[PDB]
Amino acid sequence: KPYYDVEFNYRLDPRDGGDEVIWGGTVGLMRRKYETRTVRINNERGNEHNFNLDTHGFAWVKHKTSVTEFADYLAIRQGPYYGEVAEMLKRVTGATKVHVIGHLHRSLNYNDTTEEEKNAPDMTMTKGQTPGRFVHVDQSYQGAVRRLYLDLPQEEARRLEKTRWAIINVWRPVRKVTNEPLAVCDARSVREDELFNTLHLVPMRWPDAAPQENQMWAVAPPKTPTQHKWHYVSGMTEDEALLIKMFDSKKDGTARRVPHSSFPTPDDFGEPRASTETRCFVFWEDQE
Ligand SMILES: COc1c(C[C@@H](C)O)c2c3c(C[C@@H](C)O)c(OC)c(=O)c4c(O)cc(OC)c(c5c(O)cc(O)c(c1=O)c52)c43
Ligand SMILES: O=C(O)CNC(=O)C(=O)O
Ligand SMILES: [Cu+2]
Numbered sequence: 401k402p403y404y405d406v407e408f409n410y411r412l413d414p415r416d417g418g419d420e421v422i423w424g425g426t427v428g429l430m431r432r433k434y435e436t437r438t439v440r441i442n443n444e445r446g447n448e449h450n451f452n453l454d455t456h457g458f459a460w461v462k463h464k465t466s467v468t469e470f471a472d473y474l475a476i477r478q479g480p481y482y483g484e485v486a487e488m489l490k491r492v493t494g495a496t497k498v499h500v501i502g503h504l505h506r507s508l509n510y511n512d513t514t515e516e517e518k519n520a521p522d523m524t525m526t527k528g529q530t531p532g533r534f535v536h537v538d539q540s541y542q543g544a545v546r547r548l549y550l551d552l553p554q555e556e557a558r559r560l561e562k563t564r565w566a567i568i569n570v571w572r573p574v575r576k577v578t579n580e581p582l583a584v585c586d587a588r589s590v591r592e593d594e595l596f597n598t599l600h601l602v603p604m605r606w607p608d609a610a611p612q613e614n615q616m617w618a619v620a621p622p623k624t625p626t627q628h629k630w631h632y633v634s635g636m637t638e639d640e641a642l643l644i645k646m647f648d649s650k651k652d653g654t655a656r657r658v659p660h661s662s663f664p665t666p667d668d669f670g671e672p673r674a675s676t677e678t679r680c681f682v683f684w685e686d687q688e
Pocket of ligand 2: 529530532533538569582660661675
């Protein structure tokens with residue numbers, strides 16, 4: 401198909417009932433209220449070469465990994481995957497150094513999971529992760545700084561912040577994507593006044609620990625299915641990677657942040673889409 405027209409979940413203003421806390425990995429997040437809008441998502445399979453991290457903030461690349469089982473977090477983090485992702489990412493970006501923070505594995509079907517968790521209290525944590533069905537950027541400009549100093553040593557963070565740096569997510573499906581693909585929005589089609597800093601909390605080890613803290617962009621709804629420029633690539637395989645730019649320190653016109661969201665297509669079929677998204681810092685110690 402050349403495109404789809406699908407309902408997307410955008411920011412609901414608090415004056416109209418919305419809240420400002422994204423309770424990551426909870427049943428409650430699946431119940432969050434959004435301003436829904438229908439947008440056009442252009443299929444770009446066969447046109448991937450036309451999109452890059454500098455202009456649009458995303459790129460589809462061919463990249464073979466040696467890892468096949470992505471469900472075991474410990475197996476992934478000790479194994480070679482992070483280094484494989486980091487070498488690809490430096491190759492693509494021309495970066496000077498790449499530091500992999502971690503990854504999130506997603507394997508649940510959204511609607512299946514809604515109904516199994518219909519009786520669950522909101523703060524119940526799902527075993528596994530559902531797709532990310534809301535428009536967001538994983539880090540605000542503030543959230544990117546917060547992440548840099550939380551995930552890197554203090555001296556390291558201070559120095560790398562003097563040179564150009566960026567947060568890029570490396571999204572790879574476990575197998576050929578036949579349902580709930582991932583859509584990315586042209587960074588240039590959304591303005592700064594549409595971006596809203598939003599708290600993102602992960603209540604790991606409650607009540608012994610405070611929930612983990614992160615700051616996202618929420619996105620104001622468009623007024624037109626084509627105002628925001630949405631794209632995706634059908635049938636993404638585990639030998640292909642979607643690089644999504646969440647943040648870039650460069651303030652000179654280069655794509656700085658990419659709203660993104662999964663979405664169901666009417667032709668969805670098969671067992672639930674499964675994927676990993678690997679959060680990465682990217683440093684160009686020769687710039688800025
Ligand atoms: C496996 O460990 C989890 C991760 C680790 C990272 C590597 O993915 C979590 C994320 C963190 C860690 C912070 C909150 O301390 C991010 O900072 C790196 C991050 O940028 C992220 C993200 O922007 C979107 C998210 O999902 C929408 C997840 C998040 C999630 O919502 C629920 C989850 O259960 C949690 C994890 O348990 C992840 C968070
Ligand atoms: O895979 C999904 O359903 C959503 N993933 C993301 O938004 C991401 O990789 O940051
Ligand atoms: Cu995301």
